[PDB]
Design a protein around this ligand. Structure first.
Ligand code: 9C4
Ligand code: 9C4
Ligand code: CL
Ligand code: NA
Ligand code: NA
Ligand code: NA
Ligand code: NA
Ligand code: NA
Ligand code: NA
Ligand code: NA
Lengths: 252, 252
């Protein structure tokens, strides 16, 4: 297991790390959220860049990132543009997506970026290499917002992310049944037991999947998302409640 | 689902119900436990008769049952002699097990009795009929303190308990791996979604299995054991922590 240490936080050991998402639509809302989030308790801040409605300007994006960094200098900061293809808020070109991520990487403002596995192998490899050249870690992501793939297909994808150099593979899938939640936990455990080369983040979304956001320590998900106010994906619960449950499971 | 209602407690819907066990050796210790338990919050009181010293005398056992009944007149009361055969604290003959349970049933002092599935069919059938004739519910139980059977085997056992007239089938198994915990959850979910017509209680024991004590509302276990101070089986957690998690899951 190659753990990821970001600003003294060791991802891949101990309790799953709590991630919250900041989703402001404009610079004034981002400023307000950055300030308000300071008093919530969590491990990693994700900026959901696809919720920002001035992504047209690289300057605007980097200024927003700087505002977040200014408010929370000691927090691991994850820059995530979730593509429309994988459930995000707006469609942009592939080159625009890559440019935003490269600018985030070389700005020094963020500790981690999210890169989607199926962006294209050459572009993924180039962007992973660029991140690593500038001491930025890569959360490599895949989503299925319609259904839960087979456990074997989920493992295949997580292993592909490892093969492409991801620091932290990540998969989120949508259960259509309680059985599907067990499939996700099964795939997670299969990584822990047999393909445990780096930390992985997994979740089954929606209400039925909530237990997967709570049981990461048992089956091997290194982080979990909570909501400060609004959820950034279906099934997230209030961040303080999430923390309470994680602590109970950790100490049981 | 047809629920089981005891003293206004509805077992088989809503949040899983919390059972705590009382474990004293004699009348004074049973009184001291019952008094201490006034400060705790739980749904069902189980008397673990196998922890009592003078189990030889039916009179001694009934006197203790009466003390407990009178100490907590409004709580659902479950009478459980766990045989050393199934992880309990001392041995008992099948005939004396029969005598104690029949006496508990016909005394009016208990709302529910635990009856071990593997006691023997004639004795199980007779005792189920005796319980029902006296308006006492049967938690029919099976434990494996060493290992986890296949999901197929566990589901068949729960179905057999239903066929033999259990009001609430119950199985507890010991994981030897994290995979074994998932097997128990899988069996629980199969039972609940395909075969059950009444509440069922399941658990994977030990620290490894703790999630099974928390996730009953999701996968289909109607009750869960917590510890006031001392656990009555491996893996039970503090009863207030148990309740905190159950409420968070219920409201997610
Ligand atoms: O918690 C989730 O399901 C997320 O979709 C939330 C989202 O904001 C993150 O970008 C994603 O990594 C999670 O999988
Ligand atoms: O919580 C458990 O595992 C128990 O063994 C506790 C015990 O006191 C109960 O009689 C039994 O039904 C549980 O399975
Ligand atoms: Cl560049
Ligand atoms: Na991104
Ligand atoms: Na897009
Ligand atoms: Na550069
Ligand atoms: Na005691
Ligand atoms: Na009994
Ligand atoms: Na009688
Ligand atoms: Na009765």
């Amino acid at each position: 297991m190659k753990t990821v240490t970001v600003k003294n936080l060791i991802i891949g050991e101990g309790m799953p790390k709590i991630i919250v998402s900041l989703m402001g639509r404009d610079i004034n809302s981002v400023k307000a959220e950055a300030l308000a989030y300071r008093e919530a308790t969590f491990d990693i801040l994700e900026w959901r860049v696809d919720h920002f409605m001035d992504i047209a300007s690289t300057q605007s994006v980097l200024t927003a990132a700087r505002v977040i960094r200014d408010a929370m200098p000691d927090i691991p900061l994850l820059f995530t543009f979730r593509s429309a293809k994988e459930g995000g808020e707006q469609t942009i070109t592939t080159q625009h997506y890559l440019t935003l991520n490269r600018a985030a990487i070389d700005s020094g403002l963020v500790d981690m970026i999210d890169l989607e596995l199926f962006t294209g192998d050459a572009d993924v490899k180039a962007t992973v290499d660029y991140a690593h050249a500038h001491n930025v870690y890569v959360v490599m992501s895949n989503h299925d917002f319609h259904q839960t793939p087979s456990a074997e297909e989920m493992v295949l994808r997580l292993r592909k992310m490892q093969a492409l150099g991801a620091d932290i593979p990540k998969i989120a899938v949508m259960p259509q049944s309680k059985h599907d939640v067990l499939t996700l936990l099964t795939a997670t455990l299969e990584m822990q037991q047999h393909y445990a080369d780096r930390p992985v983040i997994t979740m089954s979304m929606a209400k039925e999947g909530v237990i997967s956001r709570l049981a990461g320590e048992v089956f091997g998900s290194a982080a979990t998302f909570g909501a400060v106010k609004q959820a950034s994906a279906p099934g997230q619960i209030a961040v303080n409640d999430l923390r309470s449950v994680l602590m109970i499971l950790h100490n049981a």
